[PDB]
Subunit: 490 residues, 3 copies
């Protein structure tokens, strides 16, 4: 079984056949085989043509994540937070945490499925934790200075430190048993229960149709369209199709407007469209193709129920006033929106992974540097967007809550599933070199620096904190890159 990279040294005539019968280059989770397109479709003598196009494609992806987070994800999450009268810390700890941590948990599971890649998975988790706790927090503090909550910050950082030290001990022992995974799950459940109980205790003390449908689906404001410059007009033309598709798919609820963005026919159609998208997209449509008893597919029952509910709500409410349950739509407008993030992020990885092969690079770098960046690009986008809109407290609290979520839930679930499926009494962790311990030391240093600096700063997070964190991360990345290339021997 020759390596996949050997297709580069193999004759151009047989490269496509080698790919068709070569494994170790068929990552999934995406939708398009990029290596296949490079090596079989586009003219063999235009290698670069596909390349530059892909680069452009990559840039287009960074536009999509720029829009979905700016217009639909953050406003829906803010409406959810306002409707339930939740504090910023609680919302950041639970909702943004789940939305930013689901892909990381899925990647951790798919990596823990193979005992060989357990070290790669734990290293990727540590790298993502380092990146989020340093660079995301730094940008959050720099973009919008603010004052953080003292008690929730101390509580969250203490819980995160406990979780990190438990993971450190588990890695040092080189093995994880059933008891460890059960303890991780119990610790996360206890953290959530403590959040809810403390928040509750603190809360007690203070005491025609068609034209409106076409207009709602029009993303172009002609009055605004007329006054833009040439570059702005071109950017708007580029953004138009994806914006129209997202408007068609993702509902939005904004409490800042008197009408609360109520578009009765559009919302009724979305009540059918969004669940269908969810079932047809989750797990790449495995549940969509699933048949209930071999007679009725899941998607058919889904569309039937959606159409029934849409007809009921169409005949139940009027155009003038939005129903009292309108905020529930925001929940849907959240969930689907989060999905529109995740898939996009996956595609970004499918870019970085592939082009990489063109220039064979070390996994001691591909799996630890680029994989964590691809996993946390959605978190970075969402946190920066929320910081710009005017909610720094929530994003800053999520910056630790989400990472606690990934570490605890991902490690525990992966270990439990590996134990149950393989019927093994333990899962063995193989430490691949000293780079894992370097990552661990960097994470510990970042956590200690934050815990020492923020209370000493009287909880007024200025820009110097973020700038110093940025310097630290850049220096750490440079040190790691120098170590991998053999310049520094440890």
């Amino acid at each position: 079984m020759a390596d996949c990279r050997a297709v580069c040294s193999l004759n151009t005539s047989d490269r496509c056949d080698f790919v068709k019968r070569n494994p170790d280059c068929h990552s999934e989770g995406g939708y398009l085989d990029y290596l296949k397109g490079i090596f079989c479709y586009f003219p063999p003598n235009l290698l670069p043509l596909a390349i530059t196009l892909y680069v452009f494609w990559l840039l287009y992806l960074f536009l999509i994540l720029g829009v979905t987070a700016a217009k639909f994800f953050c406003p829906n999450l803010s409406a959810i937070s306002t409707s339930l009268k939740l504090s910023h810390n609680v919302a950041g700890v639970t909702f943004l945490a789940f939305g930013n941590g689901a892909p990381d948990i899925f990647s951790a599971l798919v990596a823990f499925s193979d005992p060989r890649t357990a070290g790669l998975a734990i290293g990727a988790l540590f790298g993502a934790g380092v990146l989020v706790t340093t660079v995301v927090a730094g940008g959050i503090t720099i973009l919008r200075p603010f004052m953080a909550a003292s008690r929730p910050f101390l509580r969250d950082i203490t819980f995160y430190m406990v979780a990190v030290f438990l993971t450190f001990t588990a890695l040092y022992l080189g093995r994880i048993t059933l008891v460890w995974a059960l303890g991780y799950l119990g610790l996360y459940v206890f953290y959530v229960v403590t959040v809810i109980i403390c928040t509750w205790v603190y809360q007690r003390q203070r005491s025609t149709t068609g034209q409106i449908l076409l207009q709602a689906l029009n993303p172009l404001d002609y009055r605004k369209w007329r006054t833009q410059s040439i570059s702005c007009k071109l950017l708007k033309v580029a953004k138009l199709p994806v914006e129209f598709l997202l408007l068609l798919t993702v509902p939005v609820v904004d409490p800042d407007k008197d009408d609360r963005n109520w578009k009765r026919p559009l919302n009724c159609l979305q009540l059918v469209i969004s669940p269908l998208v969810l079932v047809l997209t989750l797990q790449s449509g495995v549940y969509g193709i699933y048949e209930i008893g071999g007679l009725l597919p899941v998607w058919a029952v889904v569309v039937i129920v959606g159409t029934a509910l849409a007809s009921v709500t169409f005949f139940a409410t009027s155009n003038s006033e939005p129903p009292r349950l309108h905020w529930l739509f925001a929940f849907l407008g959240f969930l689907t929106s989060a999905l529109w993030i995740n898939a996009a992020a996956t595609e970004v990885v499918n870019i970085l992974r592939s082009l990489g092969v063109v220039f064979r690079l070390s996994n001691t770098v591909l799996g630890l540097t680029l994989l964590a960046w691809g996993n946390s690009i959605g978190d970075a986008f969402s946190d920066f967007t929320l910081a710009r809109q005017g909610y720094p407290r929530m994003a800053f609290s999520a910056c630790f809550g989400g990472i606690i979520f990934n570490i605890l839930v991902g490690v525990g679930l992966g270990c439990l599933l590996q134990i149950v499926r393989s019927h093994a009494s333990e899962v063995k962790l193989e430490p691949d070199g000293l780079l894992v311990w370097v990552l661990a030391s960097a994470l510990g240093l970042s956590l200690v620096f934050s815990l020492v600096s923020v209370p000493l700063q009287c909880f007024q997070l200025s820009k110097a904190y973020g700038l110093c964190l940025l310097l630290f991360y850049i220096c750490f990345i440079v040190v790691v890159l120098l170590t991998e290339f053999g310049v520094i021997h440890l």
Copy 2:
């Protein structure tokens, strides 16, 4: 002669006898031993519980240093500074320097008594210097931004750099003679004389009884007691006994009040209590028990003289007006207060040292770290408290004056005493590894960074300076810890 740690692998029945028979399991400073209590006094099984108790004890110690510095040390020192019309720089250079540097000098002497531990002593001095010049200054600048005096800062940093480079040369030569120690003493005397002369030259240019006694000893304000929360009430109850004892022992003079905290009967009793405490505590009752000619003990003459003076001042002054020499009491209220710091700090070390055995570590690096932290914990407390109260200039100047004091006086006195006692022509310094030179390079880097940054900042010390110093110290500590564990081979 087996190592003391071997008591851990030895049978539980003979552990107490093993501790008793070996004098090396003994530490001089503490009023109370700890390893003996862990082994013999406690039930062998309840080993964790006792440990937790000690942890609690440690926390209680951090409370004591929190009170003595906040209520008695800093106000007395401020009254002393105001009475003599001294500038902030002068007071920080002399008085706070002596008060924060006496334990470091004592430790340096007790370490230089043994030629083997000379390298450990010089490394501890360098580590304490690094910690004070970086972390203490960083916290001082972060807690309260201010504008520092340019000329005294430049003078102090130049003198400190000269002293550090002289120590560097002495260490490189690997030997210290009588001439070197005499030069160190002469340099410190010249520094003090220059301070006095320059300060003098500048200003010339600019041109019933019982009820009051019981009330003075009551630390509880009932009106204030009623309005505190449950946690605050519990904290006050915990602080009450030590506060009462300190009020009984340490006089305080506050010029901010009209009466200047004049409690005539309490002060008269303190005039006898404080000297008795000084003689009975200094050198662990060493001078404490000595007898004058074998007939009259020192403490008896002390109490006789104190009672005579107390009777004289009782019959000499009235309750209405405080005597013109009242500020002299502040001097006493300073000295005893400083002692109340030092002993406490020692106890903290007796915690860190001990528990260490149970989970021993690398004394080579640890001696350098935990020992310096224990020595400088009092300096850190005093400087942070003074910065909070509103005197950043004085603490910032002390941050260099005190370290000049420790380096010069400790090294010179240790070398002189070792030469005189052992009748040797020189004292040999053995460089233990490259970690000493790493410490030296870190100290030099910190000094160069300060000397380049502060003048370039127009002497307006902001928070970024301290935050950057904190990052530097954390990174340096992480690098040292990684080097000691064999991850990085030099």
Copy 3:
């Protein structure tokens, strides 16, 4: 051929003869042989007194660069910028860039003349780039906070990154051909053309005699002279001769005054003095003595033409009103002033080089530490002075424009001249150790940190950016020094 340093171990009687017949450790550029003066002139038994004198001399040099930049260079450059209505970015990109980069280009040429020193030359270029991009920018931001232009900053940093990566690739290949040098020259020409075109496009969118001569040459204001303190008076007395000489030599044009500093007789004499100085200075007289086919010397024609022009302008204008071409004088008042910088900087190097020969100074590294500092001392002085006067944008833009200038033009011209003179098809670059790659990684890290930080800061360059850069540079210098002395083995 024994090394020059061997003169130190050789007998004092033959040291001067050895120097007279010693070809190594020598260099030409200044107007003095410092080693000859140390080892032959001053009494052989007074090694130190003379050394101290040189130290004083060095300090005097730092005074000269302090005056010429403060009084004549920056005001003339500001007048040039104001007269042509140039933006700050354009002026910093072209004029200050040439003035600060001419000596670096000359040193790069004189180093590329020898194929052995190509690695030393490229390392010196990288070190100067690192120092300017970090420390100079840090001081510029700290001394005067400001808001930078976004688009020119992004453009300049992108061009600099492209140039640095091209140099990285050329060094990795270990060879430079004619095509590479021609591409470097074409890239610099394209950069200049893009600057001019973009700048042009933007603005289109917005749409008796004797007494006055003696008074002009008097640098002492008696009214101001009377009120200074003793130290200030001594400093003024020390500065008087060089100030008088510079007033005699360098014309100055200040648009802030109504008369625009018009001194008709002094300017007429300067019209002859300045060109004569230029011809009989640059190239240390190299073109200085060449003859016109023996028909006449160049200096004679120069003084004849200067006297003719001076007579014409003397008979052409009056004392009351300055001519419309007066701003052209500023151009001259710029160029000669820049020369008064360059020579001084060279002398500084002739200090550092020499005293160093006395010591066992290194070169592998030192040739890159002290040489870059000596080359960029003029740039640092000019940028700090311009930042103090109130033009931070121009100096900050020059901080990248000038370095682009040195890298591109110096490398291209050196390679082209070496190829043409030696008739070789390529120039071979020998990488001397890993320190060159360490320098490259440091430069890349600094550039990445700037490109990530400045846009994230909303282009409001505060003091924390500069302070963090200063910390980074100090740490990097300490790491390099530790690596060279064998403490850290790579």
